[PDB]
Design an enzyme around this catalytic site. Structure first.
Site, mmCIF file in Angstrom:
data_model
loop_
_atom_site.group_PDB
_atom_site.id
_atom_site.type_symbol
_atom_site.label_atom_id
_atom_site.label_comp_id
_atom_site.label_asym_id
_atom_site.label_seq_id
_atom_site.Cartn_x
_atom_site.Cartn_y
_atom_site.Cartn_z
ATOM 1 N N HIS C 54 39.760 52.142 33.498
ATOM 2 C CA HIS C 54 40.496 52.960 34.018
ATOM 3 C C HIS C 54 41.279 53.507 32.748
ATOM 4 O O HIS C 54 41.277 52.824 31.803
ATOM 5 C CB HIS C 54 41.798 52.277 34.914
ATOM 6 C CG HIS C 54 41.482 51.488 36.300
ATOM 7 N ND1 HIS C 54 40.733 50.266 36.156
ATOM 8 C CD2 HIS C 54 41.539 51.840 37.444
ATOM 9 C CE1 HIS C 54 40.403 50.010 37.284
ATOM 10 N NE2 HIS C 54 40.809 50.770 38.284
ATOM 11 N N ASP C 57 43.244 51.359 31.313
ATOM 12 C CA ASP C 57 42.816 49.943 30.643
ATOM 13 C C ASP C 57 42.376 49.986 29.164
ATOM 14 O O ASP C 57 42.383 49.042 28.682
ATOM 15 C CB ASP C 57 41.603 49.579 31.471
ATOM 16 C CG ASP C 57 41.793 49.088 32.678
ATOM 17 O OD1 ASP C 57 42.764 48.537 33.131
ATOM 18 O OD2 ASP C 57 40.811 49.643 33.818
ATOM 19 N N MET C 88 30.596 54.607 34.463
ATOM 20 C CA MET C 88 31.615 55.014 35.436
ATOM 21 C C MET C 88 33.050 54.745 34.805
ATOM 22 O O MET C 88 33.028 53.946 34.070
ATOM 23 C CB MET C 88 31.409 54.148 36.826
ATOM 24 C CG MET C 88 32.666 54.486 37.711
ATOM 25 S SD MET C 88 34.062 53.571 37.418
ATOM 26 C CE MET C 88 34.015 52.249 38.623
ATOM 27 N N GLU C 181 36.462 55.286 46.631
ATOM 28 C CA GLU C 181 36.366 53.885 47.155
ATOM 29 C C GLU C 181 37.353 53.587 48.082
ATOM 30 O O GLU C 181 38.438 53.451 47.897
ATOM 31 C CB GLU C 181 36.724 52.863 45.844
ATOM 32 C CG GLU C 181 36.557 51.382 46.316
ATOM 33 C CD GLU C 181 36.540 50.617 44.882
ATOM 34 O OE1 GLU C 181 36.357 50.885 43.834
ATOM 35 O OE2 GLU C 181 36.773 49.357 45.152
ATOM 36 N N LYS C 183 39.475 51.312 50.991
ATOM 37 C CA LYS C 183 39.992 49.953 51.154
ATOM 38 C C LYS C 183 40.721 50.006 52.513
ATOM 39 O O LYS C 183 41.550 50.852 52.733
ATOM 40 C CB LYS C 183 40.809 49.558 49.956
ATOM 41 C CG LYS C 183 41.385 48.015 50.064
ATOM 42 C CD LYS C 183 42.200 47.699 48.826
ATOM 43 C CE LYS C 183 42.220 46.169 48.737
ATOM 44 N NZ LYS C 183 42.958 45.884 47.702
ATOM 45 N N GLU C 217 33.056 48.369 48.489
ATOM 46 C CA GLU C 217 33.201 47.287 47.953
ATOM 47 C C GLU C 217 32.795 46.258 48.944
ATOM 48 O O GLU C 217 33.361 46.481 50.035
ATOM 49 C CB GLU C 217 34.430 46.985 47.176
ATOM 50 C CG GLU C 217 34.674 46.011 46.403
ATOM 51 C CD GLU C 217 35.846 45.572 45.798
ATOM 52 O OE1 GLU C 217 36.636 46.512 44.660
ATOM 53 O OE2 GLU C 217 36.794 44.775 46.312
ATOM 54 N N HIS C 220 36.094 44.753 50.408
ATOM 55 C CA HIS C 220 37.088 45.768 51.183
ATOM 56 C C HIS C 220 36.459 46.022 52.576
ATOM 57 O O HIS C 220 37.300 45.854 53.571
ATOM 58 C CB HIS C 220 36.965 47.194 50.481
ATOM 59 C CG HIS C 220 37.629 47.029 49.114
ATOM 60 N ND1 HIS C 220 37.767 48.327 48.336
ATOM 61 C CD2 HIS C 220 38.287 46.083 48.447
ATOM 62 C CE1 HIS C 220 38.419 47.925 47.237
ATOM 63 N NE2 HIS C 220 38.741 46.762 47.313
ATOM 64 N N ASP C 245 30.255 48.427 44.466
ATOM 65 C CA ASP C 245 30.922 47.514 43.555
ATOM 66 C C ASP C 245 30.667 46.116 44.342
ATOM 67 O O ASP C 245 31.096 46.109 45.537
ATOM 68 C CB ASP C 245 32.664 47.674 43.817
ATOM 69 C CG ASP C 245 32.966 48.516 42.785
ATOM 70 O OD1 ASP C 245 32.231 49.287 41.956
ATOM 71 O OD2 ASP C 245 34.439 48.816 42.661
ATOM 72 N N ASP C 255 42.838 40.535 49.330
ATOM 73 C CA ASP C 255 41.426 40.982 48.340
ATOM 74 C C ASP C 255 41.161 39.839 47.309
ATOM 75 O O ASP C 255 41.762 39.906 46.188
ATOM 76 C CB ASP C 255 41.744 42.336 47.841
ATOM 77 C CG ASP C 255 40.588 43.179 47.285
ATOM 78 O OD1 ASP C 255 39.466 42.655 47.780
ATOM 79 O OD2 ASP C 255 40.574 43.981 46.472
ATOM 80 N N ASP C 257 38.112 39.117 45.743
ATOM 81 C CA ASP C 257 37.448 39.746 44.422
ATOM 82 C C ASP C 257 36.704 38.620 43.937
ATOM 83 O O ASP C 257 36.693 38.683 42.573
ATOM 84 C CB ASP C 257 38.424 40.566 43.526
ATOM 85 C CG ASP C 257 38.626 41.842 43.940
ATOM 86 O OD1 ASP C 257 38.189 42.519 45.049
ATOM 87 O OD2 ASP C 257 39.185 42.526 43.157
ATOM 88 N N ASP C 287 33.141 44.234 40.497
ATOM 89 C CA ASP C 287 34.337 44.366 40.616
ATOM 90 C C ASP C 287 34.955 43.217 41.296
ATOM 91 O O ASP C 287 35.282 42.806 42.117
ATOM 92 C CB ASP C 287 35.079 45.554 41.390
ATOM 93 C CG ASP C 287 36.388 45.714 41.285
ATOM 94 O OD1 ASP C 287 37.119 45.167 40.583
ATOM 95 O OD2 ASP C 287 37.117 46.640 42.149
HETATM 96 CO CO LIG Z 1 36.576 48.031 43.803
HETATM 97 CO CO LIG Z 2 38.668 44.235 45.865
#
Ligand SMILES: [Co+2]
Ligand SMILES: [Co+2]
Ligand SMILES: [Co+2]
Ligand SMILES: [Co+2]
Ligand SMILES: [Co+2]
Ligand SMILES: [Co+2]
Ligand SMILES: [Co+2]
Ligand SMILES: [Co+2]
Lengths: 388, 388, 388, 388
Positions: C54, C57, C88, C181, C183, C217, C220, C245, C255, C257, C287
Site C-alpha cells: 500500500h 506501507d 501488485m 477486492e 469484503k 480473498e 472474505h 488473495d 477477519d 487472515d 494476504d
Molecule cells: Co486481502
Molecule cells: Co482479510
C-alpha cells in the site's frame, strides 16, 4: 496402507442414518424405505459394531401390541445372526404432529404427559435390547416467537420430565444413563439448551445429575460457529461425555449431517486426537445422512467412508503425538507449563511473591514467542501425511 | 411522551464505552482520550446512575504508587461531586502484550501468577470504591490453533484462578461477587467458555459456586447466533444473573458493540420484558462503542440513545403484558398450561393414567392450533405502538 | 518428499502481511515494525517471487517529496539485490481518520477528491516499480446505520471514481489493470460490494469494464458463509480473475487472515485444483496475518507454511485428477455429460423432441444414483495421501 | 389508527405460502392441503391483489391434458369471481426426485432437456393467466461436494438454458420478463448464484440481458449475513429489480420464511423506505410459511400480519422522511453532499486542484463528526412511533 474397520472399533450407526429416505423440506424421498433387518446385515458386513434407534424407527407409530412384538422379534434375530449390539436408544418426540409445540416442554399439559409415557415405554425396550445409554434430543423444544414460550417455565417442565425419568429408572433398578443432545436451531426457530454448555449447566440442576451426561454432535455445535473439540474437552473435564455423534458440517447453516470427515476436516482431526488421548471408550456413533442424490450403492459407500475417515485421522493423530519433533515443539510452546498448577504454593505464598508482580519483568515475558505457528504446521504436515 | 432517564433507573456505563478513542484493527483513533473525570460529569448530567471500569482504565499501566493514589483521588472527588456510584469493576487482562496467550490460562506459569496478582490488586480497589460485582472477561483465554492449548489443562488453570480469587475474597471478608462474561471468539480464534451455557456449567465446578454468577452481553451471545433472551432466561432460572451488559449487534460477525436498541430490535424488546417481569434489580450496564465516525457530540448522543431505547421498550413491554387482549391471547396459546406441573400427581399416578397414553387421542391433540402468530402480531403491534 | 518453493511458483506477499505488528481491537503491538528492506530480503531467502504494498506501507503518511524518494530508492535497491518483483500495488484508504466515512464514497465531497488524488499518485509509483495489477479494497466504504448512506448515491460515487481512474490510466497509456477486492463487513457494519458477485456486477456498469477485474480473498468470501471455490469459478467464467488473495478463515466471524491452508482445509484443496486446472497464471498472493502470539521467528515460519501448504495441495490435486480410478468415477457421476450442451440441436428441435417430455421416463431417470459420495471419498483419500 | 390493506397496495401471495402443509425435514404435515380455489377467495377477502404459483402448485404432477384444463378452468373462475390477478408464475424444478441433481444444471443431459420443456410449458400457461414476470429459483442447482459439479461447466448450462428461454419468449412475441431468485444454500450444500450480486453478474453474460432481472428474498440474502436493503439498492441501481419476495429471517440459519416484519425489524423498515422512495411499482410478493404450530385460523392471521406490517412500516418511513428535524439531520451528515458528483469538473481539473491534495487540510477534515448516531436515533424514534 488400508483402514479396515472392525467391531472392536466400536463403530455404530443409527437406523435413521443409512435408512434416510431423502425427504427434504423442498423435495420428496429419492430412496425406498430400508427394512431394519437389511440395515443390520449390511452394516455388519461393513464392520460396524452395532446400531441405535428411535422407538418409531423400529416399530411404526400406532403399531398394535401384536405388531410391536413381531417387529422386535425380527430385529432380535438379526442382531443374533450378526452379533451386532444396541448400545444406545432414543425416542422420536419430533415427527408426529402432536409434538408440533414440543414433547417435554409442550404448552399443552396432556401432550407433556403423553411424551413421558411414550419415552418410558421405549426405555423399557431399550433395556431389553441391551442399551447402555438413552439419548434425548428435544428437536421440538423451543419456539419461533418471543411470547410463545416462557423459557423459565419451560425449563421447569424440562427438569420435571428428566427428574421423573431418573426416578423411573432408579425405581426399576435399570443400569442405563441419560444423554441430552443439544442443538442450536432447526426445526424450531430456537431450541432450548442449544449448546453443550447449556446442556451441561441444566444437568447440574437435576435431582440426580450423576444420571445425566451429554451427547454432542459435530454438526450441531458447528451450527452456532463453536469449536467442537473445545466443547468436547469441557464435557470430558466435567465427566459428562456419555456418548457422541460424529458427522460433517459445512460452517453455519441448516443441519447437513454429512458423513464423518466431511465439512471441517481439521476440526475432525483435533476431535479424534482428543477422543483418543482422553481415552474415550464410548461408542463412535455416526449420525449422518447419505445425500439424496445417491442410490442404495451410494448409501453403503457413504457409511463405509465414515469409518475409514475416522481410522485415517486416528492414525495421523497418533503419529503426530508420537513424533519427537512434535513433542519438542509442544515444550517450546510451553504446553508442559500449562499442566503445572498456577499457585500450588497457595494464596498467601502467591501474595508474598515479589517475582509475580513487584519484580516481574513483563517486558521480557511479553517478548517470548509462543511458537504456535511452527507447532500447527507440524500438525498440518502430519494430517496430510506429508512429513518432510 | 418523552423518556428522561433518572439515577433510579440504574443506568451505568463503562469508562471504556464513551471513552473509546475509535482504534480499530484497520484504523487509528478518531477521537482524543477522555479524562475519567469528564466522563463521570457528562454521564451524570445525562442521568446515569454510575460508571464501571478496568484497573487500566482508571490508572494507566505502570503507574507508580504515587500516581495511582492521585488518579483515584481525582476520580473519588468526581463521584462525590456528582453522586455517581461504582457498582462494578473489572481487570484488563487483554491489552498488554504480556497477555497475548491469555491471563489465567496463559501457557507461561509466570504470566498466570502475574495475572492473579494484578486482579487481586484491583479487587481491593473495587471494594474501596464500593463495587458490588467484579466481572471477569477472559478475552485472551483461547487459541488460534488446535495443538496450541489443551482445553482440559486450561480449564484446570481457569478453575484454579477463580478458586483462588474466591479464597482471597472470603479471607478478606469482602462482600463482593464474581461475574464471568462469556464471548464466542475475538480477539482469539476461539475463547474458552464461549457462551452463557459454558460459563454456567463451569461455575458449577468451582469450590464456591455461590460466589460466581454470569455477566452476559447482548452482542456476544448473538455472535454465535443464539437467542439472548433465552440465554438470560436460563441464567435467571439458575439464579446466576449477577450483572448484564446491554448493547447492539447486527447478526453474526465481529463485535460491533452498538448502542442498546440497535441491531436486533425485537430481541431487545423481549429482553427488556424478561428483565422487567423477572424483577431484575441489578444495574443496567451499557457496554457499547460510539462509532468512530462520530465526534464528542456524537458520543454523548449515542449514550443518551441507549437509556432512551431501554425506557421506550420498557414502556411497550409493560403495555403488552397489561393488555387484556394479550392476556386472553396468552391463555389461548396455553401459556398458563405451561406453568402447571406435568405430573404433580407423581410417577406411579402418571404410569397408571390411561388418559395419558392408552386412551390419549393424539389426533385431536395435534389438530389444536397454538395461535402463536396472533400473539406475536399483538406483540409486534405493541412494540411499534400501533394498537388497532 | 519435501516442497521447496521457488520464484517460478509466483508466490508473493504483502508488506503488511509479515509486517503486521499485531495491533488488534483489544490489544497493542506485540512485534516491532519491520523495515521494508528486511522483509524483501527475508522473503527472497524463503523463495518468494515478489512483494506487494500500500502507498502507506512503503512511504509513511505525510512524508515529504524528499523522504518519499529516499524510501523508494532503498526499496528499489533491495528488489535489485534480490531479483524480487512488484506485481501488485494498492492504496491505503482506510487507516487515516480522514477516511472514517470512506474514501471514494465518503459523504464529504472534499474527502472523495482527496481519495482520488492519493490513489492516482500511487498508481504512478506502481507503474514505476513495475506493477501489473492495481487492487482497490474499499474497507471504509459502507455504514453502521440505515440512514447514514444512500447506496444508490454511493454506487454513483463509486462508479465515478473507478471511471475516472480508468480515464487517467488510458490517458497516461499505462499498461495496468484494476482489481476490486470485496469484503462483506469489517471494519464497517456493512461494506459496499460485499461479495465477488456484487463486485462483478458493479464492474459491468463501468465505462470500460475491460479494465476492471476482481481480487477475491479466501477469508472474505467465507465471512459470508459462501463457497470460495464456487466464487472463483464464476470469476474465471467471466474472465475477471485478475488477482487473488490466499489465506485461511475459521467459518463465520472477524477477519482472521490466517496462513494459507488453515481454516477450511478441504476448501483450500478444491481451490488449488481449480486454479491449476483452469490455468490461472496470476501471482499467488498471500494476504495473511502472523498470530500476535508469535515472534519474528514465528512470522517467517508462518509465511513459509503458506507456500508449503499450496505446494502440497497442488500435488494432491494433480494426483487426484490424474488417477484413472478418479477419471472413471467422474464419468460414473456424469461429469462428462455436464460438459455437453443441453440443446445444441436448437430450440425448435428441443420443442419437437418427444423423448424430452412426452415420452421421457422420469421414474427411471430419478432412480439413477449420482455416485457423488464415492467420488468425494476418492478425493478425500487423495488429499490425506491415503490411497488404498 | 388501523392499516387496512387494499388491492391497490399490490399485495400478492404464493399458493405455496398459505398453502404450506407444514412438512419439515423432521416432522410431518400438521395441516390439510388447501384447494387453490379456497386460497384465492380467502386471500381476496383479506385484501390481497393477486396470487402467484408454481406449475406443480396449480396442476398436480403427472396430470393428464384433461385434468390440466379442469384445474385451470376452476382457478380461472375463482380469479374472475374475485378480481384477483396473477402477476407472477414459476416452475417447480426441485420437488420431484428427478431434479435431485438440479434442473438446468443437472449432470444428466436428458434431465436438463426435460427441465426446459417443463418450464416452457408453464411459461405458456403463465402468459395465458396474465403473468408479467416469470421467476426462476434454482433450488437444486449446486452440490454437496467439490468434485460433484464443475461450476464453469454448470454456468455454461445455466446460461444455455436462460438463453434458450429468452429465444422462446421473443419467438412467441410474449411480453414477459424473467426473474432469477438467488439463495446461498439449502436444500443443496451450495447453490449456484447464491446472492443478488452473483445473479446480477450472471445476467450480464446472457444474450439478452434486457430480458432478465432479479427476484431477491429478504430471508435468502440474510442467510449469508448480508444487508438486504443494500442488496436491493444495488439491484435498483442496475435497474434489475423486476420482482421481490418479502418475509422474515432470524439471522443466519435454515430458511425460516417467517411472515413479513418478523426477524430483522429494522432491516424491514429500511427496506420499505427504499422501496417507497425509489418508487418501486412491482408487486409486494410474500414468500412466507405459516408456522406448523398453527391451524387454518393461524394461517390467515399470519398472512394478514404481513400486509399490516408493511403498511405500518410504510407510514413510519414516510413520517421519517417528511420530518423537518430529520431533513436537517440528513444535511448535517452531508447526505446531500454524497449526491453531488465527485469530479464533475473532470479529471484534468481534479489533477490541477491543489485544494484536493497539495493544500488539503486532512486534520480538519478528519475532525468533522458525521453525526450518524443522532440521525439513527431519529430514525429509531420514528419507527417506534415515539417522537419526543
Ligand atoms: Co486481502
Ligand atoms: Co482479510
Ligand atoms: Co444433525
Ligand atoms: Co444427532
Ligand atoms: Co462486545
Ligand atoms: Co461486555
Ligand atoms: Co425462503
Ligand atoms: Co422466494
Amino acid at each position: 496402507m488400508n483402514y479396515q474397520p472392525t467391531p472392536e472399533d466400536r463403530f455404530t450407526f443409527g437406523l435413521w442414518t443409512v435408512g434416510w429416505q431423502g425427504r427434504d423440506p423442498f423435495g420428496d424421498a429419492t430412496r425406498r424405505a430400508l427394512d431394519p433387518v437389511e440395515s443390520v446385515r449390511r452394516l455388519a458386513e461393513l464392520g460396524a459394531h452395532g446400531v441405535t434407534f428411535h422407538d418409531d424407527d423400529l416399530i411404526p407409530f400406532g403399531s398394535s401390541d401384536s405388531e410391536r412384538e413381531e417387529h422386535v422379534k425380527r430385529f432380535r434375530q438379526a442382531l443374533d445372526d450378526t452379533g451386532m449390539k444396541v448400545p444406545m436408544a432414543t425416542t422420536n418426540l419430533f415427527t408426529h404432529p402432536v409434538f408440533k409445540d414440543g414433547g417435554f416442554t409442550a404448552n399443552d399439559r396432556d401432550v407433556r404427559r403423553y411424551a413421558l409415557r411414550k419415552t418410558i415405554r421405549n426405555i423399557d425396550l431399550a433395556v431389553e435390547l441391551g442399551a447402555e445409554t438413552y439419548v434425548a434430543w428435544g428437536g421440538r423444544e423451543g419456539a419461533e416467537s418471543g411470547g410463545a414460550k416462557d423459557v423459565r417455565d419451560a425449563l421447569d417442565r424440562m427438569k420435571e420430565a428428566f427428574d421423573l425419568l431418573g426416578e423411573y429408572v432408579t425405581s426399576q433398578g435399570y443400569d442405563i444413563r441419560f444423554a441430552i443432545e443439544p442443538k442450536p436451531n432447526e426445526p424450531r426457530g430456537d431450541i432450548l439448551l442449544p449448546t453443550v454448555g447449556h446442556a451441561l449447566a441444566f444437568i447440574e440442576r437435576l435431582e440426580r445429575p450423576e444420571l445425566y451426561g451429554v451427547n454432542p454432535e459435530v454438526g450441531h455445535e458447528q451450527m452456532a460457529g463453536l469449536n467442537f473439540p473445545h466443547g468436547i474437552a469441557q464435557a470430558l473435564w466435567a465427566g459428562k461425555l456419555f456418548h457422541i455423534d460424529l458427522n460433517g458440517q459445512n460452517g453455519i447453516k441448516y443441519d447437513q449431517d454429512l458423513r464423518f470427515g466431511a465439512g471441517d476436516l481439521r476440526a475432525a482431526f483435533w476431535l479424534v486426537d482428543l477422543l483418543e488421548s482422553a481415552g474415550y471408550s464410548g461408542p463412535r456413533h455416526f449420525d449422518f445422512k447419505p445425500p439424496r442424490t445417491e442410490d442404495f450403492d451410494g448409501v453403503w459407500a457413504s457409511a463405509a467412508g465414515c469409518m475409514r475417515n475416522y481410522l485415517i485421522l486416528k492414525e495421523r493423530a497418533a503419529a503426530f503425538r508420537a513424533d519427537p519433533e512434535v513433542q519438542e515443539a509442544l515444550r517450546a510452546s510451553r504446553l508442559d507449563e500449562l499442566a503445572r498448577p498456577t499457585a500450588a504454593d497457595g494464596l498467601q505464598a502467591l501474595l508474598d511473591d515479589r517475582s509475580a508482580f513487584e519484580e516481574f519483568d513483563v517486558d521480557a515475558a511479553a517478548a517470548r514467542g509462543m511458537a504456535f505457528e511452527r507447532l500447527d504446521q507440524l500438525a498440518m504436515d502430519h494430517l496430510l501425511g506429508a512429513r518432510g
